[PDB]
Design a protein around this ligand. Structure first.
Ligand SMILES: *[C@@H]1O[C@H](CO)[C@@H](O)[C@H](O)[C@H]1NC(C)=O
Ligand SMILES: *[C@@H]1O[C@H](CO)[C@@H](O)[C@H](O)[C@H]1NC(C)=O
Ligand SMILES: *[C@@H]1O[C@H](CO)[C@@H](O)[C@H](O)[C@H]1NC(C)=O
Lengths: 135, 48, 49, 35
């Protein structure tokens, strides 16, 4: 809360130089993304918290009740850090510490293993990967 | 002769070019659109 | 992302967006139709063998 | 840098068929149409 500028994000160090008559920075979308701390004269850079998408890989409900979950477009080491109470919108963080993680170009999927033979595509994952329910 | 003709001018691959331009020029107008007020006091949601 | 484009990082705007019903899930359903179809356009041209 | 200015929720999903696999379909078309 800087001089009435309420928001939410993470504050870092920035090298961009502000003239003495400037206090706020802006971008193309015309939203503030750089402020000056009103007690020192240092410049801070505002960027939002980590966000993304979640997909669920499931066979038929009658066939089984076991699933796999994909985190779209994230380096696979980002999500284990965020495993704490009142820190992730989905509350089922137990799954993140589940089965072995395989990293793909669409993000790493948890709960499914990675064989290296070839089959026909069953459930298309993305960028040349397909998941299936086998023995 | 075909290999040089393809790389001769910048309008050879025009049909595949406006396909990728129209799909990225349409995204910029979406982003720039949220700086408007639509008759409100301000375009920023928190200060209202 | 319907909920974050419109009411980004505001806690008292996302609640108001819920009263609008089923707008966001129609957009997610229409754009998933486009995305799934785009994989068929390439599976019908090159995969004739 | 504009692609990083998409903190409003505008993302781009990757295609199912990678480029190095499309070049293999085209290779088979060109190797079964000349023999
Ligand atoms: C349960 O799902 C399986 C999926 O293969 C289907 O074959 C079967 O008919 C279903 N049974 C029901 C809906 O009672
Ligand atoms: C994840 O980050 C690590 C550390 O910088 C890097 O070595 C790796 O290439 C990244 N993986 C992906 C899939 O981007
Ligand atoms: C494929 O995986 C098996 C075990 O899952 C391993 O023994 C084998 O060496 C792997 N093949 C290659 C080419 O890495």
């Amino acid at each position: 809360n800087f001089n009435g500028l309420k928001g939410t994000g993470v504050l870092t160090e920035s090298n961009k130089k502000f003239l003495p008559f400037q206090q706020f920075g802006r971008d193309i979308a015309d939203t503030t993304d750089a402020v000056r701390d009103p007690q020192t004269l240092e410049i801070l850079d505002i960027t939002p918290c980590s966000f993304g998408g979640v997909s669920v890989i499931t066979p038929g409900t009658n066939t089984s009740n076991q699933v796999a979950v994909l985190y779209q477009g994230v380096n696979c080491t980002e999500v284990p850090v965020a495993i704490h109470a009142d820190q992730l919108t989905p509350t089922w963080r137990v799954y993140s510490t589940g089965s072995n993680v395989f990293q793909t170009r669409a993000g790493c999927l948890i709960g499914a293993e990675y064989v290296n033979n070839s089959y026909e595509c069953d459930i298309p994952i993305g960028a040349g990967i397909c998941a299936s329910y086998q023995t | 002769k075909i290999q040089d003709s393809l790389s001769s001018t910048a309008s050879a691959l025009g049909k595949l070019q406006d396909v990728v331009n129209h799909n990225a020029q349409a995204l910029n107008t979406l982003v720039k659109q949220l700086s408007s007020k639509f008759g409100a006091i301000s375009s920023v949601l928190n200060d209202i | 992302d319907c909920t974050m484009y419109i009411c980004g990082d505001s806690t008292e705007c996302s609640n108001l967006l819920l009263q609008y019903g089923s707008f966001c899930t129609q957009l997610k359903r229409a754009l998933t139709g486009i995305a799934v179809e785009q994989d068929k356009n390439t599976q019908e041209v090159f995969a004739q063998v | 840098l504009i692609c990083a200015q998409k903190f409003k929720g505008l993302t781009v999903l990757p295609p199912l068929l990678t480029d190095e696999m499309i070049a293999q379909y085209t290779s088979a078309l060109l190797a079964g149409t000349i023999t």
